[PDB]
């Protein structure tokens, strides 16, 4: 359903946030 | 649906957060 | 609808968080 | 509605998070 | 209602995130 | 209900985010 | 339910965010 799909898009965007934070982790380690 | 669309706007805003975090990682690199 | 409108407030708030993160990025450059 | 007003409480806490992030930026100068 | 109460729990958890971010700011100050 | 319970899981996850942020603050203090 | 399962996916992504932040803490150590 459309509400379920939109929520899934929210979860995907949150994963993108996790990845960007890992990029920050690596930047600090560099 | 309006609830679905609103949720999709939340997903989009979360993507902007992930981008902002990339700018932070970039500021750290250089 | 009030539920949709409240969700849009949440998206707006998340955008403000994105802009604040960019302020963090800017401060790290400087 | 109780559900809408709870969502508004969520929006308000998110604004508090944005302000805290601004405080971090300020700390960094 | 149980759904509204759960949303209130989310709001409270987010407040805790704000406080932890304030802690980070304090740490950066000195 | 399953929706209320899932929202509570989200609240719990947000609390883990707050704690991780406190870890970041601790690391910054040495 | 599909709505509940999607919200559970949101919870798991948030946990991934908590873990990424832990890695940032470790990096700062």
What whole-number distance in Å separates Cα of residue C22 and Cα of residue D13?
Answer: 19
Residue B30 buriedness (CB in 10 A; 0-12 / 13-18 / 19+): exposed
Looking at A1-30, list the stretches that DSSP marks H as alpha helix, in order from N- to C-terminal side.
Answer: 2-29
CB-nearest to E14 from D10, D23, D26 is D10
- Test the E interface: residue of D4, D19, D24 with most E CBs within 10 Å: D24
Beta carbons of A28 and B28 less than 8 Å apart: yes
Task: Please report, for residues B29, C29, D4, D22, the alpha-carbon distance to residue F13 in angstroms, rounded to integers and kept in the order given.
Answer: 29, 32, 22, 23
Beta carbons of A3 and B4 less than 8 Å apart: yes
Cβ atoms of B17 and C14 within 8 Å: the answer is: yes
Task: Please report, for residues C8, D6, E10, E24, the alpha-carbon distance to residue A4 in angstroms, rounded to integers and kept in the order given.
Answer: 17, 20, 19, 35
**Which of these, A24, E11, D13, A6, lies nearest to G10 by C-alpha position?**
A6
Calculate the CA dihedral of residues B26, A13, F4, D10 and round it to 10 degrees. Answer: 50
Cβ atoms of G24 and A20 within 8 Å: the answer is: no
* Determination technique for this entry: X-ray
Cβ atoms of E7 and D10 within 8 Å: the answer is: yes
What whole-number distance in Å separates Cα of residue A7 and Cα of residue B10?
Answer: 9
């Amino acid at each position: 359903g459309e509400i379920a799909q939109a929520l899934k898009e929210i979860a995907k965007a949150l994963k993108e946030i996790a990845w960007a934070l890992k990029e920050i982790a690596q930047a600090l380690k560099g």
